[PDB]
Amino acid sequence: MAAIRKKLVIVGDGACGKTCLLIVFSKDQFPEVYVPTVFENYVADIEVDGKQVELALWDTAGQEDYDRLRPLSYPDTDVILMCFSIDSPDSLENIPEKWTPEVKHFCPNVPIILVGNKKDLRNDEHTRRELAKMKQEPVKPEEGRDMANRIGAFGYMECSAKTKDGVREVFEMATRAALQARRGKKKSGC
Amino acid sequence: NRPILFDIVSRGSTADLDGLLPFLLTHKKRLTDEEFREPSTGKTCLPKALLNLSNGRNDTIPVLLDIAERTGNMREFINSPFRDIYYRGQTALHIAIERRCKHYVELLVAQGADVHAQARGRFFQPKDEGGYFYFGELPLSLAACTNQPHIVNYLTENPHKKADMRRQDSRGNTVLHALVAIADNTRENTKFVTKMYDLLLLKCARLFPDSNLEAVLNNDGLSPLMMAAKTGKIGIFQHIIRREVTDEDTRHLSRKFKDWAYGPVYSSLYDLSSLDTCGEEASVLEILVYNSKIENRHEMLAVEPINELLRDKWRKFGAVSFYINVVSYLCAMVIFTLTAYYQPLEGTPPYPYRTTVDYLRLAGEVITLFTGVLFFFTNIKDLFMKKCPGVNSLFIDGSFQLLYFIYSVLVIVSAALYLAGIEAYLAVMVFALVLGWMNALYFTRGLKLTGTYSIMIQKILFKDLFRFLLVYLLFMIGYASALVSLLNPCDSETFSTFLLDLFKLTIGMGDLEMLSSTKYPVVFIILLVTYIILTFVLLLNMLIALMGETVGQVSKESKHIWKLQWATTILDIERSFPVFLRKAFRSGEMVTVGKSSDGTPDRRWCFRVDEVNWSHW
Ligand SMILES: CC(C)C[C@H](NC(=O)c1cc2ccccc2s1)C(=O)N1CCN(C(=O)[C@H](CO)NS(=O)(=O)c2ccc(Cl)cc2Cl)CC1
Ligand SMILES: CC(C)CCC[C@@H](C)[C@H]1CC[C@H]2[C@@H]3CC=C4C[C@@H](OC(=O)CCC(=O)O)CC[C@]4(C)[C@H]3CC[C@]12C
Numbered sequence: 072m073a074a075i076r077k078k079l080v081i082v083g084d085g086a087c088g089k090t091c092l093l094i095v096f097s098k099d100q101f102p103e104v105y106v107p108t109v110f111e112n113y114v115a116d117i118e119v120d121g122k123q124v125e126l127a128l129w130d131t132a133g134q135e136d137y138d139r140l141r142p143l144s145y146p147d148t149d150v151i152l153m154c155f156s157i158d159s160p161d162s163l164e165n166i167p168e169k170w171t172p173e174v175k176h177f178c179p180n181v182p183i184i185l186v187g188n189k190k191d192l193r194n195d196e197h198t199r200r201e202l203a204k205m206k207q208e209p210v211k212p213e214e215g216r217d218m219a220n221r222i223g224a225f226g227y228m229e230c231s232a233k234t235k236d237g238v239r240e241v242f243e244m245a246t247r248a249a250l251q252a253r254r255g256k257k258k259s260g261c
Numbered sequence: 262n263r264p265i266l267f268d269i270v271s272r273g274s275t276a277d278l279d280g281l282l283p284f285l286l287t288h289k290k291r292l293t294d295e296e297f298r299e300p301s302t303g304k305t306c307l308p309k310a311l312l313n314l315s316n317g318r319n320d321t322i323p324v325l326l327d328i329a330e331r332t333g334n335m336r337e338f339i340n341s342p343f344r345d346i347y348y349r350g351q352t353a354l355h356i357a358i359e360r361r362c363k364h365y366v367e368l369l370v371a372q373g374a375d376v377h378a379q380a381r382g383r384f385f386q387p388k389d390e391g392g393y394f395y396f397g398e399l400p401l402s403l404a405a406c407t408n409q410p411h412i413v414n415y416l417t418e419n420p421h422k423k424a425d426m427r428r429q430d431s432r433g434n435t436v437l438h439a440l441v442a443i444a445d446n447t448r449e450n451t452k453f454v455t456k457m458y459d460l461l462l463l464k465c466a467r468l469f470p471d472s473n474l475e476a477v478l479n480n481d482g483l484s485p486l487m488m489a490a491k492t493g494k495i496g497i498f499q500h501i502i503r504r505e506v507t508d509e510d511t512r513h514l515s516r517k518f519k520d521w522a523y524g525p526v527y528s529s530l531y532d533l534s535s536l537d538t539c540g541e542e543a544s545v546l547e548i549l550v551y552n553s554k555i556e557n558r559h560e561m562l563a564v565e566p567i568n569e570l571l572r573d574k575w576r577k578f579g580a581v582s583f584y585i586n587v588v589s590y591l592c593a594m595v596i597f598t599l600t601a602y603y604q605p606l607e608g609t610p611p612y613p614y615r616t617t618v619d620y621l622r623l624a625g626e627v628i629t630l631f632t633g634v635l636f637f638f639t640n641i642k643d644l645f646m647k648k649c650p651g652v653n654s655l656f657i658d659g660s661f662q663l664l665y666f667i668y669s670v671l672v673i674v675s676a677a678l679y680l681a682g683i684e685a686y687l688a689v690m691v692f693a694l695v696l697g698w699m700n701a702l703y704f705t706r707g708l709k710l711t712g713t714y715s716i717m718i719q720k721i722l723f724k725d726l727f728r729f730l731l732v733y734l735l736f737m738i739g740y741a742s743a744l745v746s747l748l749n750p751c752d753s754e755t756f757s758t759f760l761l762d763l764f765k766l767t768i769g770m771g772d773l774e775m776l777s778s779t780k781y782p783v784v785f786i787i788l789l790v791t792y793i794i795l796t797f798v799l800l801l802n803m804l805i806a807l808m809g810e811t812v813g814q815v816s817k818e819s820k821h822i823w824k825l826q827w828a829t830t831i832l833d834i835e836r837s838f839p840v841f842l843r844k845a846f847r848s849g850e851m852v853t854v855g856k857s858s859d860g861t862p863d864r865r866w867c868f869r870v871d872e873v874n875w876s877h878w
């Protein structure tokens with residue numbers, strides 16, 4: 072009947088493919104030449120279960136001067152995509168230390184969905200050979216399964232923008248998380 | 262180049278813009294770059310251009326739009342939202358609509374401007390929250406609230422994009438909700454509000470025949486009718502109640518029908534599908550009555566169907582049960598009084614019951630305790646029934662709703678003592694009895710002859726008498742402390758005895774013997790004389806001045822307040838009935854006035870009234 076508008080914000084460390092993920096959702100065409108540093112001011116139509124939802128997609132960066140304005144994008148957020156890389160293990164241990172407390176500081180009681188990018192790159196040989204120079208290995212999916220549990224993520228998934236695998240299901244899970252009404256209030260003052 | 266570009270666009274000059282496109286192409290700098298955007302609020306070139314312009318023809322907009330198109334960033338640029346707090350979410354389309362220029366609205370919509378963008382800045386929030394203007398946080402709602410029928414008509418039906426009228430903002434308010442929110446009781450505002458409301462409702466019904474726009478509810482659960490009733494906006498409320506549509510195609514959504522005319526007598530059939538609800542959903546009547554701080558509650562109560570519905574409801578069952586209520590309560594109070602009188606002081610409570618009189622005596626205590634428990638249960642059920650009304654509902658008004666709670670406590674509290682604290686249960690039992698006897702004016706509220714008396718005594722007691730008693734207590738404390746200090750005994754017991762003597766004097770009886778023992782008797786008598794003069798002569802009967810003025814206000818508004826109190830008591834009595842019985846007592850008919858679009862019968866509950874007119878010739 073009437074589409075419901077929901078706010079989705081994607082946050083992740085640099086070069087993780089957040090912009091690529093949203094772009095592939097947008098036009099279903101991987102940009103192989105030019106990728107904007109941020110993809111902003113876009114609303115996409117999605118239907119999951121008898122409901123029509125307009126999802127407003129916001130991106131956050133910190134490459135240059137975007138960290139100062141990043142806080143402005145948090146308020147009135149309905150769902151968060153905590154995004155990281157499977158080909159870059161360093162993208163994992165930084166999620167709890169610095170990103171999570173900021174997320175809870177600005178926008179608490181908001182559903183958070185964990186996502187790892189570059190599923191194919193975890194099985195690549197050149198990436199493994201280069202990474203072994205520093206005694207490192209690709210991110211283990213089971214480690215992600217557990218890491219979702221630790222940070223209380225609503226759900227954790229994998230995406231591959233190159234082969235458009237799981238993008239639709241991942242963002243559908245994001246939307247179903249968003250439509251959820253949450254649980255009242257906790258320890259509400261008298 | 263932000264300052265130079267801002268100055269050029271503000272001045273409206275078009276020649277200066279020449280050469281910007283080659284510069285952007287060579288430097289590959291987008292028009293949305295942080296440097297171009299104003300740091301203060303993320304403002305961009307387009308909103309600055311639209312804000313200031315000459316006769317609505319800034320003339321710089323098309324050139325900037327073409328430049329953005331060449332850069333390939335038109336979608337991002339046109340609908341770039343403002344950052345910060347005060348003007349968060351504002352876009353170019355909102356500004357174009359506000360400035361009452363149709364041309365720029367058409368241009369922005371055609372070029373791809375978003376039409377569902379929401380403005381959520383604090384400035385756009387309601388008046389009481391901190392925002393000076395509220396319009397539903399939507400473009401179409403903003404146009405409707407600003408009395409721009411042409412803009413609304415164009416925006417609703419456009420070949421490029423359409424703004425569905427059944428669209429809800431974050432608050433849940435739709436276009437009708439916002440239109441009611443800005444509605445005012447002024448003569449000019451009401452006319453355009455009603456006209457726009459009718460136009461928009463008719464358009465929505467015409468485009469979508471299956472769904473009725475008024476059905477949609479906000480997050481609070483209210484509808485435009487209910488919200489208007491709660492906010493005290495009579496101008497739109499009365500029109501909504503008696504809405505009649507002459508059009509045959511969409512006459513189903515009308516709320517007032519014509520039954521028949523015999524000579525000067527005209528009988529018309531109103532609809533009350535949502536005006537009265539038997540617990541199925543919130544009703545306009547309950548919201549209008551129980552809620553506090555309503556600007557025009559008394560005027561809104563005096564409408565054609567409300568009075569007749571209250572009269573019929575009172576006649577059908579209200580009178581039958583009201584007297585039953587009075588009789589039962591008075592009988593219970595008499596039983597309680599008899600139990601209290603025949604209380605054996607001798608012996609330690611509890612007492613053994615062996616004699617014939619014990620049969621009768623125990624029953625009184627059992628009945629009183631069960632009645633108190635029933636009162637407590639009724640008063641918790643009622644509190645939860647109204648979705649837990651706050652302090653304002655209980656303390657300020659409807660004092661009797663709180664008093665029976667106190668009566669509920671003491672009566673059971675004594676019982677506990679009667680089991681263990683045997684010695685001093687009478688002390689609180691007697692006070693409970695006194696309070697119960699004194700709080701029977703709730704039943705007198707209903708009577709027309711004595712309806713005002715209870716309301717006005719409750720009103721004057723807490724407001725006038727206490728305000729006067731503050732000053733009286735200042736005087737009392739000062740004078741009593743002075744007199745106690747002055748006297749020479751040659752101490753708590755002496756002070757208490759002196760206070761007792763002084764109070765007995767204050768009544769107007771007793772004797773003035775204290776002066777004999779004290780030193781400086783002359784000043785003591787002077788101070789007593791000042792005390793008596795001030796209090797008795799001036800204050801005691803100058804309170805009567807504003808007391809009589811209060812009773813004068815009540816006399817001037819006696820008819821209006823009695824109607825409210827009678828409605829309150831009858832609704833009160835009704836709400837305690839079970840749901841099935843209430844449905845069995847439904848009022849109205851099931852007239853099938855009209856058929857739906859597909860021909861199915863509406864079969865909606867209604868209620869018919871009649872009046873007389875002699876000039877309809
Ligand atoms: C049973 C129906 C036919 C009528 C119903 N009366 C009763 O249920 C009882 C009367 C009596 C008398 C003596 C002993 C036991 C009962 S049980 C009835 O009509 N009403 C009760 C609910 N009402 C209330 O609860 C108000 C409004 O919420 N609150 S109150 O001020 O605290 C009050 C007022 C009178 C009574 Cl009495 C009990 C209460 Cl807490 C309204 C009015
Ligand atoms: C004008 C009004 C609205 C304000 C005053 C409030 C009254 C409730 C005060 C005024 C004087 C007070 C009385 C002053 C002295 C006493 C004696 C005291 O007990 C005694 O008899 C003292 C003997 C002893 O303890 O040895 C009990 C309270 C009483 C009656 C006080 C109870 C409350 C009274 C009547």
Ligand SMILES: Nc1nc2c(ncn2[C@@H]2O[C@H](COP(=O)(O)OP(=O)(O)OP(O)(O)=S)[C@@H](O)[C@H]2O)c(=O)[nH]1
Pocket residue numbers: 083084085086087088089090091106107108109131132133134189190191192231232233234
């Ligand atoms: N092997 C592999 N590489 C990918 C895949 N998707 C993206 N990459 C790379 O990820 C990059 C994601 O772009 P982006 O997120 O903007 O990088 P960034 O430098 O981290 O951006 P920023 O957060 O500093 S502002 C793309 O440019 C692409 O080269 C994939 O599916 N498989």
